[PDB]
């Protein structure tokens, strides 16, 4: 008799490494607390100011399309225990599997469902990329890696953070690149980029950073963020992917409205994506 959210190191046996989450390596573990021979698979992220904020946030969320908090283990450091999403990320999935257009439109829809909820709870994700969206057994999107997620203070529209280390700047709106201000609408921009990725089946050669650097026309370096910002401010965007319908590119372009106030909300995007998914099913 005790708290299920408390995980004990003696019953966690590591199967393998899964990947590098932002601010923490994720691994796969078998948790057999009752020694019944089977236990359960779980994902475990090792964390070292806001270095716990991913646990603080993710434990307050309950939704089918957001990866589910299970508990913690601190037997200095901390291990976030999450559900194991067994098919991994879309970035590594889509290039290795054949996937139709409607199925892609359905993954996009699910992301919006999860993100509408997230924003309702007054959080921003700040890391919405195909790489951080995971598939379960039924090919259901679970949104993951809340390493950069923040609580938007109440009454406010954005949150200001200048990340001392790496961040996904090729998924980031100009206000993010320029003012380090992250609105709810900024996550919609990232979703837009995430949908571009979907439709390119995450071909690395067509990936947002590959594309954006070609368009900038200058080699990667200290001035890139500035040039990317000036490029996006001139209204250039990622190209319509091959065999992507015009109507679906328009959706991406609307999520890519330069000024953040003119972008769709995740609420607004849900009916639209259902209707467009229907049209191509
Ligand atoms: C969201 C990413 C950044 C992290 C690393 N991540 C990865 C996985 C995963 C990775 C794989 C492979 C294909 C082997 O690399 N699989 C099958 N699953 C995973 N599963 N469940 C989770 N919560 C979870 C996760 O967070």
Layout of strands and helices, then pairs:
Blueprint: E1 12-21, E2 24-31, E3 40-47, H1 53-58, E4 69-73, E5 78-83, H2 90-93, H3 101-120, E6 123-124, E7 133-135, E8 141-143, E9 150-151, E10 158-160, H4 174-179, E11 181-183, H5 184-199, H6 208-216, H7 224-233, H8 246-255, H9 266-279
Antiparallel strand pairs: 1-2, 2-3, 3-5, 4-5, 6-9, 7-8, 10-11
Helix pairs in contact: 3-5, 3-9, 5-8, 6-7
The ligand CC(C)[C@H](C)n1cc(-c2cc(C(C)(C)O)n(C)n2)c2[nH]nc(N)c2c1=O binds next to strand 1 and strand 5.
PDB class: transferase/transferase inhibitor
Keywords: Kinase, complex
Assembly: monomeric
Your description of this structure?
Belongs to the protein kinase superfamily. Tyr protein kinase family. JAK subfamily. This is Non-receptor tyrosine-protein kinase TYK2. Interacts (via FERM domain) with JAKMIP1. Interacts with PIK3R1; this interaction is important for cell migration. Interacts with MPL/TPOR. With 281 residues, the chain is an alpha+beta fold. The chain has two domains: 84 residues, Phosphorylase Kinase, domain 1 (2-Layer Sandwich), CATH 3.30.200; 197 residues, Transferase(Phosphotransferase), domain 1. The protein has nine helices and eleven strands. The strands form four sheets. Strands 1-2-3-5-4 form a five-stranded antiparallel sheet. Strand 2 and strand 3 form a beta hairpin. Helix 3 packs antiparallel against helix 5, helix 3 runs antiparallel to helix 9 and helix 5 packs antiparallel against helix 8. It is globular. The N and C termini lie far apart (49 Å). It binds ligand 5U3. The site of the ligand CC(C)[C@H](C)n1cc(-c2cc(C(C)(C)O)n(C)n2)c2[nH]nc(N)c2c1=O has 19 residues, from strand 1 and strand 5. The site of ligand 5U3 has 19 residues, from strand 1 and strand 5.
